[PDB]
Amino acid sequence: MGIELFVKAGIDGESIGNCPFSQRLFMILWLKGVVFNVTTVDLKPGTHPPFLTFNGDVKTDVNKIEEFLEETLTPEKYPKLAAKHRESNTAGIDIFSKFSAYIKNTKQQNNAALERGLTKALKKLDDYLNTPLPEEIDANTDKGSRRKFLDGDELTLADCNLLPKLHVVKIVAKKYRNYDIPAEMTGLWRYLKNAYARDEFTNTCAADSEIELAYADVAKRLS
């Protein structure tokens, strides 16, 4: 029967829509190397996408699905995707909610404090990406880390979670608040540059226009 992934449809009805949970499961299956089909849904159960077919059995809930896929598609045929360092699994965890509060606020009074909160949370992630892992420390003779992703030089489940959310942040905060992720965060930008160079991330992103239009009614203008 196989594996079929159902993701959110875009505004046009056909394209992949804005949904970080959809992109997360899409990336996991891609990175596992398993054979699968991906399909868009509009739901007009009730079941909200994403969800997946596994030999005909319906699996819902993104968090349970990740665990099922990581523990079912195992070595030796499939790569283990779990991060090795526990800290990779929480880095940048609060960014998406600090971004959500920043763009939904209507009061000009609170904008500065909300902007700082998003920036501070982004900075804590930048600090994690710059702190050398212990395997990095054992290979010189702290000079700053040069690893590509959260957990080291290969993509993990932690990246499949963070990267779609970071993509929404970057595009929406720029479009609706003219916010730029600060250039001085060299660690975080190295990470995004390495991710965007990977098909598994870039080719599972929704289009810029689609993401921006998806927030037309969620992002608010300041009073």
| Domains identified in the chain and CATH numbers | 1-82 (3.40.30.10), 83-223 (1.20.1050.10)
* Resolution value in angstroms: 2.2
Tokens of 183: 């250039």
Question: Which helix H or strand E contains 8, and what residues bound it?
Answer: strand 3-8
Q: 149 near 194, Cβ under 8 Å?
A: yes
Question: Which helix H or strand E contains 180, and what residues bound it?
Answer: none
The alpha carbon of residue 115 and the mean position of all alpha carbons in its chain are separated, in whole angstroms, by 20
**What strand order describes the sheet that includes 51-54?**
37-41, 3-8, 51-54, 57-59
Q: What are phi and psi of 7, to 5 degrees?
A: -115, 170
User: Cα separation of 92 and 72, whole Å?
Assistant: 28
Q: 4 near 29, Cβ under 8 Å?
A: no
User: Cα separation of 213 and 66, whole Å?
Assistant: 28
Residues 6 or more apart in contact with residue 148 via CB below 8 angstroms = 154, 190, 191, 194
User: Cα separation of 152 and 122, whole Å?
Assistant: 19
Alpha helices in the chain (DSSP H): 20-32, 62-72, 95-104, 111-130, 134-137, 157-177, 186-196, 199-202, 208-214
DSSP 3-state of 5:
strand
CA atoms within 13 A on the CB side of 110: 15
The angle at the Cα of 119, spanning 116 to 125, to the nearest 5 degrees, equals 145
Q: How was this structure determined?
A: X-ray
User: Cα separation of 127 and 144, whole Å?
Assistant: 10
DSSP 3-state of 201:
helix
